[PDB]
């Protein structure tokens, strides 16, 4: 709590996702972290946030990284794709 | 175009135990904090100090023990202590 920023940044920098947990829940936790960082004066823009998320994608989700080498893609757009892929894996 | 991600990753994974010059450590940490700021991500004194302290090992861990909740310590103050310790370690 004293170290909220450091912990949130660390989490953002070490994200891993390959569809082993629900896409919704992953999305919710990443949104929460991005929102809290912003509220604590550390602005993570769409590009930087997308890069942190993309770099943690493994399994089939790595192909989303390969596909979006996408100028002006939003977190929302990336999360849409992730959810789509997750739904297809069920 | 991944400069911010790289710089934040560096900041989050710092390591210093006196095996390299304190000056060089300080220079690289300053460089990263400056470049982040220039790329619209200012990192305040507290957060910067926490990242540096967390990376201290060997005898430098004792600086973290002494200062973990040292309210309103500056990066400059922390760097001073690290440099002092380094100078004392030199033969």
Topology overview:
The structure is a homodimer.
Chain A: H1 4-13, H2 23-39, H3 46-56, H4 62-67, H5 75-89
Description:
It is classed as virus like particle. The entry lists the keywords Retrotransposon, virus like particle. It forms a dimeric assembly. The entry is titled "Ty1 Prime Retrotransposon Capsid C-Terminal Domain, wt". 2 copies of one chain form a homodimer. Chain A is mostly helical and 90 residues long. Chain A has one domain (4-89). Chain A contains 5 helices and no strands. Chain A has helices at 4-13, 23-39, 46-56, 62-67, 75-89. The interface between A and B is medium-sized, with 18 and 19 residues.
- Secondary-structure-derived class of chain A: mainly alpha
Helix content of chain A: 55-70%
The topology string of helices and strands of chain A comes to HHHHH
Classify the beta-strand content of chain A into a percent band: under 5%
What is the count of structural domains of chain A? Answer: 1
Strands of chain A, count: 0
Number of helices of chain A: 5
Shape of chain A: globular
Describe the main β-sheet of chain A briefly. none
Distance between the termini of chain A: 37 Å
Task: Give the C-alpha Rg of chain A.
Answer: 13 Å
Describe the oligomeric state of these chains in a short phrase.
homodimer
Keywords (chain A): Cytoplasm, RNA-binding, Transposable element
GO biological process, one term (chain A): viral translational frameshifting
Subcellular location (chain A): Cytoplasm
Protein name (chain A): Transposon Ty1-MR1 Gag polyprotein
């Amino acid at each position: 709590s004293d170290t909220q920023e450091v912990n949130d940044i660390t989490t953002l920098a070490t994200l891993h996702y390959n569809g082993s947990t629900p896409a919704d829940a992953f999305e919710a936790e990443v949104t929460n972290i991005l929102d809290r960082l912003n509220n604590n004066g550390i602005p993570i823009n769409n590009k930087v946030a997308c890069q942190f998320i993309m770099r943690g994608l493994s399994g089939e989700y790595k192909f989303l990284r390969y596909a979006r080498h996408c100028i002006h893609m939003t977190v929302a757009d990336l999360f849409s794709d992730i959810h789509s892929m997750y739904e297809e894996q069920q």
